[PDB]
Amino acid sequence: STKNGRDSNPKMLGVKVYGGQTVTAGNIIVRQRGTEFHAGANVGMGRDHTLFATADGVVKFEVKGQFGRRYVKVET
Amino acid sequence: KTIKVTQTKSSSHRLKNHKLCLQGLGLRRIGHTVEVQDTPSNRGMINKVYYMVSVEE
Amino acid sequence: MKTLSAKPAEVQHDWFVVDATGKTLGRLATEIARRLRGKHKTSYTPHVDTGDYIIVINAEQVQVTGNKALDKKYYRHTEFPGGLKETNFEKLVAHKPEEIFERAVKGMLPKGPLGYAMIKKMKVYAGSEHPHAAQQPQVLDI
Amino acid sequence: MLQPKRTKFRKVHKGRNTGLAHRGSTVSFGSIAIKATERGRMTARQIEAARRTISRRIKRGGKIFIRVFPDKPITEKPLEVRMGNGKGNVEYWVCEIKPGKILYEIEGVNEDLAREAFALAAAKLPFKTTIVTRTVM
Amino acid sequence: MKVQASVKKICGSCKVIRRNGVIRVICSAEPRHKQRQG
Amino acid sequence: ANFVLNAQARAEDKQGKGASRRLRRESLVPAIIYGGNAEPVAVTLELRELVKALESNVFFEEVVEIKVGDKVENVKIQALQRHPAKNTPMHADFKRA
RNA sequence: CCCCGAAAGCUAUUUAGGUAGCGCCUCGGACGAAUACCAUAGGGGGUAGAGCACUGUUUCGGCACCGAUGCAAACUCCGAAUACCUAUGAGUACUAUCCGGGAGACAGACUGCGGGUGCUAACGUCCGUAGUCAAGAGGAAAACAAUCCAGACCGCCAGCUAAGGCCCCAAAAUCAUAGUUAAGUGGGAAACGAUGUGGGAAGGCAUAGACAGCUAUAGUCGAGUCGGCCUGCGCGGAAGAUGUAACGGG
Numbered sequence A: 001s002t003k004n005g006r007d008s009n010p011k012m013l014g015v016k017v018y019g020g021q022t023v024t025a026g027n028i029i030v031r032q033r034g035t036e037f038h039a040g041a042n043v044g045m046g047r048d049h050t051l052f053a054t055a056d057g058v059v060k061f062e063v064k065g066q067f068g069r070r071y072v073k074v075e076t
Numbered sequence B: 001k002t003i004k005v006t007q008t009k010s011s012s013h014r015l016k017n018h019k020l021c022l023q024g025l026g027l028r029r030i031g032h033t034v035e036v037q038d039t040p041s042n043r044g045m046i047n048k049v050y051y052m053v054s055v056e057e
Numbered sequence C: 001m002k003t004l005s006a007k008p009a010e011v012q013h014d015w016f017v018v019d020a021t022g023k024t025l026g027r028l029a030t031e032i033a034r035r036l037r038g039k040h041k042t043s044y045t046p047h048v049d050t051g052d053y054i055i056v057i058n059a060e061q062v063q064v065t066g067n068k069a070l071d072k073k074y075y076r077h078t079e080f081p082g083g084l085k086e087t088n089f090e091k092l093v094a095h096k097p098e099e100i101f102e103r104a105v106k107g108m109l110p111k112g113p114l115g116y117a118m119i120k121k122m123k124v125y126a127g128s129e130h131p132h133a134a135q136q137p138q139v140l141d142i
Numbered sequence D: 001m002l003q004p005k006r007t008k009f010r011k012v013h014k015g016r017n018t019g020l021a022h023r024g025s026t027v028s029f030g031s032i033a034i035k036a037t038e039r040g041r042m043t044a045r046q047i048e049a050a051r052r053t054i055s056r057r058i059k060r061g062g063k064i065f066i067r068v069f070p071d072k073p074i075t076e077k078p079l080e081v082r083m084g085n086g087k088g089n090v091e092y093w094v095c096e097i098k099p100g101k102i103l104y105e106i107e108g109v110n111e112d113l114a115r116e117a118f119a120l121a122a123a124k125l126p127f128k129t130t131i132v133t134r135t136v137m
Numbered sequence E: 001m002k003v004q005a006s007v008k009k010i011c012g013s014c015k016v017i018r019r020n021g022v023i024r025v026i027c028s029a030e031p032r033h034k035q036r037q038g
Numbered sequence F: 001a002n003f004v005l006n007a008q009a010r011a012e013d014k015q016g017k018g019a020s021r022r023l024r025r026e027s028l029v030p031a032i033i034y035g036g037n038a039e040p041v042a043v044t045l046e047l048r049e050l051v052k053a054l055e056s057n058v059f060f061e062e063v064v065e066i067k068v069g070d071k072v073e074n075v076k077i078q079a080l081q082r083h084p085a086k087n088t089p090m091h092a093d094f095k096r097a
Numbered sequence G: 001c002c003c004c005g006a007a008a009g010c011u012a013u014u015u016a017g018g019u020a021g022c023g024c025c026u027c028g029g030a031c032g033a034a035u036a037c038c039a040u041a042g043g044g045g046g047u048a049g050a051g052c053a054c055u056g057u058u059u060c061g062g063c064a065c066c067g068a069u070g071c072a073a074a075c076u077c078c079g080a081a082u083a084c085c086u087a088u089g090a091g092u093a094c095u096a097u098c099c100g101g102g103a104g105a106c107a108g109a110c111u112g113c114g115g116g117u118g119c120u121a122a123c124g125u126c127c128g129u130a131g132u133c134a135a136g137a138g139g140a141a142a143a144c145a146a147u148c149c150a151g152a153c154c155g156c157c158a159g160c161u162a163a164g165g166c167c168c169c170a171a172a173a174u175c176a177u178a179g180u181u182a183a184g185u186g187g188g189a190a191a192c193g194a195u196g197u198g199g200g201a202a203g204g205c206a207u208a209g210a211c212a213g214c215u216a217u218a219g220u221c222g223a224g225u226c227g228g229c230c231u232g233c234g235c236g237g238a239a240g241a242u243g244u245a246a247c248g249g250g
């Protein structure tokens, strides 16, 4: 007999909106377990580190700051 | 300014995008010849299925 | 129905004599089979025998290349258990030269009643003489 | 018998052996060496046997460097056991060999003696080998 | 006669020859060195 | 002076994986010459000549002359690539000196 | 008689050869360019490869550290090709989408590529991806669902080709030019062994005289010879049961 054979259900994480797409307020941009990406201008952060848009506009990704973090923002 | 394209092999067992490239050029059967504008969009479909077409300028 | 078949009542068989001295067995047998079946006439018909009569003289002077004189095997089976018999080319050519030609041409002719009929027009003789002078055969260099 | 003193995981996937040996194909310790020209597997018993033969031939007059280590475990089913019911038990350890991999090097021994010892050793191995010497570049 | 897959020269009075497509070793000094590949 | 290598030009249509493999099938060797105050130049050599030059120890310290047509470059050997299993040379670097 | 045309998947089930919703088929209505193929432009990645900067593991030197050296599905300082999402555009195409009537199906198989399992066994088993069969005839592979070429509306004693072929069975070259093989190799099989034969790059010795034989380093003898390295094609290793039987035959 074996002692293995367990696994958990999938969680479906990942980027939902890519750069250059238009969004409306409330749209979810990234699903992530930890803060792989950080919230920029017009982007909010949920209690499970989800990133969502707080304005209408166009999504942009970049690398900024002294620690070299990855940021996502919405341009109006 | 214009290219003549002839189909030389069967397309029954090929990949789906390759069949779509043939249909988007307008070729319908073996030995069919069509005449198309010389644009990069058309040369893309031609180069994708180079192996079963013959091209004359 | 414009394409016509040859009629057996009008076929004409000519007689030829061939000397086998120094010839290669298979390259002679191909031509003999061609002329027996009648592929060389413009009246050729698949279901009619239109060929010629071929006499073969000096049968034991036929040759093979390489080491086939020692190595080429002839088999037969009596239908009793364990009854497989074997010989080779040198013994067979010294014993029954006609059997070698019969096997070689039989292999190249069609396998049916028409093929049996076509093989009957080949006459093979060991020496330099044949008993068919009454048919006045012509010399054929093939 | 060579074997890792400790491992993170007992059993590993089979994998695939492809490519050439761009690393480990240059003589670095001795003056002369033997390298494989064909790909395969090398077991701990084979490594031990080849080492023993080489040492006995060279009479312990020089240093022998071994540059292959068996760190991949191989499992087998117990026998008369049907398919399924989990993975089998570990039986022996191997090292993957790609063409160009150097197996043994010799330092401090005459070249004819080294070639004789390598010729003796090559008859114990499951792949074809060749002899190389140090070069400037 | 030794019949084997690998035939070699043992001493200096041995000689390798080819007869009728077969490789043999014959020795002038020792009859026990006679070998045939096979 | 002691070491002269005859070379041909290697144009842009002779660069890449396929072209290099065709050259090595033709039994030639691609090589690159770089160094101070000038733009790198790509050339091709003969395998036999290269092997003969590498057969001697002094070649790795002297200044050699590579001649392609009329021009000539004075260089030293800087790097070398070998086939892992066959040890045949495959590429060469030369630094202008 | 005419038109279209699947599936053997996901989820749940005292469920596993049953059934239900969704996916896939067909018919009617609405609505048309909102769709796809390709080209440009924008975007995230952690796989192949590689590496040792972390976690482990490895060899040899020096005094836990230093110097050289390897390895990793559950290691990463790095990091493609493809695939995927969005916007604009030419050309080609009856495309997408929505609302309703009727279903069938939820036992799959082989082949190639990436893998787990097994013994890098199986016409084995379990996934991902593409083709074919299923539900597909014709030509080729002797015969041979799943391989190669190719998609049959009906008729013709017309022509051109594909895969594969052109000595005879059996349609078409006993065609042309330059080489290799002597094993019927072609037309089953490995480590290994060997003056078999072609080709190539070197090295040693040599007509003030080389190798072998010969006569006690001398000496008769008069041109090449010696030993290795790559590479084409061949040889041995090669034993089974009704009958040649491992080119379909000649």
Ligand SMILES: [Zn+2]
Pocket (backbone or CB within 6 Å): E010, E011, E012, E013, E014, E026, E027, E028, E029, E030, E033
């Ligand atoms: Zn002896």
